[PDB]
């Protein structure tokens, strides 16, 4: 269930143990998905109020949303999570194929006429 996007079922398995305690393992299991929800806040979402993504983890209203909201963006505003969905800078690169392809063209010319 950790393989796919099954989150809620994993947090249902957090507490539904028939075998033994498993407490130290579901506390690592807690942190390693805390930074995973704290990762998947970073999409091209819209404005989310201070209830929805406030309750996607396991909290009502502590300052843990101040810990995440000052940790990453989606800044604390008037019931607002700010979307800096930019993804703008990296394209329009002619020079990198004009270096790599400039290597690979001559590398095509090496095993083309010269005897090996």
């Amino acid at each position: 269930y950790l393989m796919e996007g099954s989150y809620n079922k994993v947090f249902l398995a957090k507490g539904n143990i028939p075998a033994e305690s498993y407490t130290f393992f579901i506390d690592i299991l807690l942190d390693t998905i805390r930074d995973e929800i704290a990762g998947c806040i970073e999409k091209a979402y819209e404005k989310i109020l201070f209830t929805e993504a406030t309750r996607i983890l396991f909290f009502n209203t502590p300052k843990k949303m101040t810990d995440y909201a000052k940790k990453r963006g989606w800044v604390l505003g008037p019931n607002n999570y700010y979307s800096f969905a930019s993804q703008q800078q990296k394209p329009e690169d002619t020079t990198i194929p004009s270096t790599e392809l400039a290597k690979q063209v001559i590398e095509y010319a090496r095993q083309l006429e010269m005897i090996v």
Binding site: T94, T95, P97, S98, T99, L101, A102, V105, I106, Y108, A109, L112
Partner: protein, 154 residues
Amino acid sequence: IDAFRLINANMMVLGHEPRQTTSNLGHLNKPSIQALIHGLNRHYYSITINYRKNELEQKMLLNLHKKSWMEGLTLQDYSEHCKHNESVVKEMLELAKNYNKAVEEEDKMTPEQLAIKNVGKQDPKRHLEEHVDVLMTSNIVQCLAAMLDTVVFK
């Protein structure tokens, strides 16, 4: 060229063979049968020669005869390069159909008959690998020369 010179016809009347070889230096080039028809020897002789050259002359004619200027730093008729790149491939299809023809009469009469028998009509094999070289050299040069100018010019 073969610079010659007269020999005495008096010694020819004497029956005496001239020129008294002391060095294996003159009997190195063989005279022609056509000059042997003439009087190259009976009346004249050949001389072995060479030529005097130096680095003062070798560089100033080597570095100057076939030299480009900025020609390879061009694009070679940028609309018509790809047009030519179909103007060969189109008949290369039918020549590849002749390559889908001539292989099919193998395991037949022995290939020495496939050496004499093909002197009226074209082969797909040599004509095929010809255009592979043509299309290759026509493309890779314009490809790399197109991509240097992106780096050099801004």
